[PDB]
Amino acid sequence: RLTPTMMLYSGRSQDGSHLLKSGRYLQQELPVRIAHRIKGFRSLPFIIGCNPTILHVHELYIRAFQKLTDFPPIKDQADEAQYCQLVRQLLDDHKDVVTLLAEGLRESRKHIEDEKLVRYFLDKTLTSRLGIRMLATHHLALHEDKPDFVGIICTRLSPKKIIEKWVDFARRLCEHKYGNAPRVRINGHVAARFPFIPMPLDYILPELLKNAMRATMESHLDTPYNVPDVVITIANNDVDLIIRISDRGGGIAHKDLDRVMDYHFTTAGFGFGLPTSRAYAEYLGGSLQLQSLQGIGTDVYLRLRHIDG
Amino acid sequence: RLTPTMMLYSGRSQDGSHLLKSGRYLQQELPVRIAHRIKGFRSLPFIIGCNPTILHVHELYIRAFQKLTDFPPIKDQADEAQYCQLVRQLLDDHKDVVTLLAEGLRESRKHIEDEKLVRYFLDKTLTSRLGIRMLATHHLALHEDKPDFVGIICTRLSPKKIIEKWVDFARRLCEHKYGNAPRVRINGHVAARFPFIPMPLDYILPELLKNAMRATMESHLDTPYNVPDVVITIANNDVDLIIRISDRGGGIAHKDLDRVMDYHFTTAGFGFGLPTSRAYAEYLGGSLQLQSLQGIGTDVYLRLRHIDG
Numbered sequence: 001r002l003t004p005t006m007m008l009y010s011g012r013s014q015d016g017s018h019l020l021k022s023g024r025y026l027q028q029e030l031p032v033r034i035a036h037r038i039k040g041f042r043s044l045p046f047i048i049g050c051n052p053t054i055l056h057v058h059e060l061y062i063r064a065f066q067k068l069t070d071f072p073p074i075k076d077q078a079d080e081a082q083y084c085q086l087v088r089q090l091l092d093d094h095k096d097v098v099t100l101l102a103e104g105l106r107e108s109r110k111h112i113e114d115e116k117l118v119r120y121f122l123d124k125t126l127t128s129r130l131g132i133r134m135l136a137t138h139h140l141a142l143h144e145d146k147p148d149f150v151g152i153i154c155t156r157l158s159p160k161k162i163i164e165k166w167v168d169f170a171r172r173l174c175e176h177k178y179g180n181a182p183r184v185r186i187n188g189h190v191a192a193r194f195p196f197i198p199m200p201l202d203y204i205l206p207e208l209l210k211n212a213m214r215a216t217m218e219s220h221l222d223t224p225y226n227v228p229d230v231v232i233t234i235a236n237n238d239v240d241l242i243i244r245i246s247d248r249g250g251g252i253a254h255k256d257l258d259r260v261m262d263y264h265f266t267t268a269g270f271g272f273g274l275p276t277s278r279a280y281a282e283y284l285g286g287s288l289q290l291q292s293l294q295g296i297g298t299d300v301y302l303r304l305r306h307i308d309g
Numbered sequence: 310r311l312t313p314t315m316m317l318y319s320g321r322s323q324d325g326s327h328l329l330k331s332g333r334y335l336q337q338e339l340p341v342r343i344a345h346r347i348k349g350f351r352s353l354p355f356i357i358g359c360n361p362t363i364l365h366v367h368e369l370y371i372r373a374f375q376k377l378t379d380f381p382p383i384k385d386q387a388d389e390a391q392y393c394q395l396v397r398q399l400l401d402d403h404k405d406v407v408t409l410l411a412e413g414l415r416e417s418r419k420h421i422e423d424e425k426l427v428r429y430f431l432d433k434t435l436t437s438r439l440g441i442r443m444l445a446t447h448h449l450a451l452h453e454d455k456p457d458f459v460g461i462i463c464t465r466l467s468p469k470k471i472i473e474k475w476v477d478f479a480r481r482l483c484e485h486k487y488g489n490a491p492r493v494r495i496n497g498h499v500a501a502r503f504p505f506i507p508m509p510l511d512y513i514l515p516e517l518l519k520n521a522m523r524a525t526m527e528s529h530l531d532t533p534y535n536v537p538d539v540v541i542t543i544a545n546n547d548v549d550l551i552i553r554i555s556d557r558g559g560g561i562a563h564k565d566l567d568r569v570m571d572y573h574f575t576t577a578g579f580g581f582g583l584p585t586s587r588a589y590a591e592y593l594g595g596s597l598q599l600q601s602l603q604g605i606g607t608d609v610y611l612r613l614r615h616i617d618g
């Protein structure tokens with residue numbers, strides 16, 4: 001069952017033939033998708049494309065294409081096993097790509113007149129990248145025998161559990177900077193369990209939690225020891241999963257509202273949290289919507305489609 | 310200070326000359342706006358325009374134009390006083406217009422192929438009507454000496470007070486039908502007071518409250534004696550007033566979501582509550598936005614711009 005035009009193999013065999021079919025799928029799929037990313041770099045405005053960090057990333061993708069296309073057609077388990085080593089190397093080599101693009105683009109984008117251009121390039125590049133890393137990680141995970149997982153697909157994911165995971169994480173970060181962190185309540189369908197892919201949530205949830213906690217602390221500088229809770233509601237229905245994250249952090253100002261979804265815009269991280277999360281949600285067939293109550297707080301609505309039966 | 314291109318006179322004199330200037334303004338303004346509504350009827354699809362209820366309303370507007378244009382130019386207080394009698398008559402004669410349009414259009418709109426057509430006609434007709442009734446009522450109110458009012462403009466409106474007014478009202482209606490009504494909590498800027506025109510709120514608030522209470526009751530048929538509260542948050546900033554109305558009434562279904570803002574669409578009133586409220590909010594420079602958590606509830610966000618300094 002599929003992410004967009006990308007299928008995650010739920011097949012399984014004892015002879016391990018599902019691993020060869022998966023491996024062969026990747027082998028046919030990855031080079032084409034990397035070619036697309038390279039075409040993306042080739043079409044960047046010249047002046048942005050000449051930035052040395054952008055050039056570095058452009059070269060990384062070329063190298064990846066080279067390694068992928070030089071790898072021989074998979075015929076046996078020894079082949080597949082070796083291909084996995086390559087996939088692991090590329091996953092690691094490219095792990096800082098978002099950060100590098102942010103850096104390379106930060107100034108150089110100001111050099112051009114179409115602001116739509118960079119946004120489009122980042123949405124496209126980052127979401128294609130997520131899709132590639134999902135397929136790749138899924139293949140590697142097929143070798144695992146974690147219970148409740150078929151690759152990266154959790155067969156019985158609890159939204160509440162994964163939210164709490166990221167809450168603990170964001171609270172620790174927040175405490176480190178402010179001395180305290182809002183407490184988080186979670187309500188709604190807290191007992192929901194369903195088949196789901198965690199990975200997008202692992203990107204998005206911490207970004208939105210960090211935003212909500214930061215806003216809460218910075219609007220309560222006089223009582224850091226007593227700040228309004230962040231409240232999270234889970235709604236699980238047959239079509240989608242909805243996670244609403246509500247804070248009393250004072251809201252997103254009218255003057256900032258039309259900018260918060262721009263890559264690089266920050267009123268402080270490096271301003272990628274919101275546009276990246278939205279691009280990811282929409283890529284997967286969901287959405288990310290903001291409701292600002294200026295003077296009071298912000299509600300953020302994450303919607304992700306369910307895995308189709 | 311103004312609604313769109315319509316100015317509400319805050320002028321005041323002891324000789325009562327502000328009343329003559331206001332009266333003269335109305336006299337120049339109303340006939341033109343009524344002419345526009347008549348042109349709206351003239352352009353309706355023939356088959357809809359021939360509906361007898363639609364024809365009735367079309368005639369009402371013609372009569373109104375006739376009476377308005379036959380009235381002599383205002384020169385003195387006796388004139389103005391008489392013009393007020395006319396305005397009062399028209400206000401009353403036209404008080405059921407929304408209901409009549411709903412009825413006349415209900416079936417006849419199915420006869421045509423552009424669904425955008427009726428929506429546009431209603432948005433335009435209903436909002437122009439609100440604007441006219443606001444100007445008209447404002448003029449009449451200039452004769453009043455209610456404290457805290459300049460015409461229909463409240464100089465120190467409390468959002469909490471007007472919300473409670475409509476809560477009591479909606480709860481009574483709801484209790485009459487279900488035996489109980491959700492309790493309502495109000496939070497946020499509960500002590501806010503500012504200059505504001507109540508009239509749009511008096512339309513919108515009861516519509517949204519009725520929706521929220523109905524949804525809550527119909528999703529709790531087994532425990533009507535114990536239903537989730539409706540929760541209302543007031544956010545007051547320098548740009549707008551935001552009133553969020555949140556229920557745990559189960560949400561607006563995915564299959565219904567794209568229809569709830571259509572005139573006439575109802576899953577039960579007569580399906581005008583939402584599209585009418587949105588048209589009114591947008592006419593006044595605000596908005597009405599819905600966030601559905603299918604399986605849990607709905608958040609409705611009403612935003613109205615503040616009176617400009």
Ligand SMILES: Nc1ncnc2c1ncn2[C@@H]1O[C@H](COP(=O)(O)OP(=O)(O)O)[C@@H](O)[C@H]1O
Nearest residue numbers: 211212215260266267269270271272273274298
């Ligand atoms: N929940 C929130 N409350 C208030 N402001 C927010 C919230 N979420 C985001 N923002 C604003 O949006 C801006 C952009 O957020 P983001 O894309 O995550 O980048 P960053 O957090 O690195 O600035 C933030 O700088 C902040 O001003």
Ligand SMILES: Nc1ncnc2c1ncn2[C@@H]1O[C@H](COP(=O)(O)OP(=O)(O)O)[C@@H](O)[C@H]1O
Nearest residue numbers: 520521524569575576578579580581582583607
């Ligand atoms: N808060 C809500 N919760 C659930 N459903 C709602 C809510 N508000 C509106 N709806 C749905 O939207 C439809 C249209 O609402 P409206 O325009 O007010 O007309 P009516 O209430 O007369 O049907 C309703 O019939 C109902 O199905």
Ligand SMILES: O=C(O)[C@@H](Cl)Cc1ccccc1
Nearest residue numbers: 087090091094097129132136
């Ligand atoms: O940019 C990335 O992170 C990805 Cl596209 C690199 C990669 C390519 C192919 C296979 C696995 C990882």
Ligand SMILES: O=C(O)[C@@H](Cl)Cc1ccccc1
Nearest residue numbers: 396399400403406438441445
């Ligand atoms: O349809 C209405 O309610 C309004 Cl437009 C009728 C009216 C016209 C002119 C003055 C006052 C009321």
Ligand SMILES: [K+]
Nearest residue numbers: 260262265271
């Ligand atoms: K941003």
Ligand SMILES: [K+]
Nearest residue numbers: 569571574580
């Ligand atoms: K409707």
Ligand SMILES: [Mg+2]
Nearest residue numbers: 207211269273
């Ligand atoms: Mg952030």
Ligand SMILES: [Mg+2]
Nearest residue numbers: 516520578582
């Ligand atoms: Mg209604």
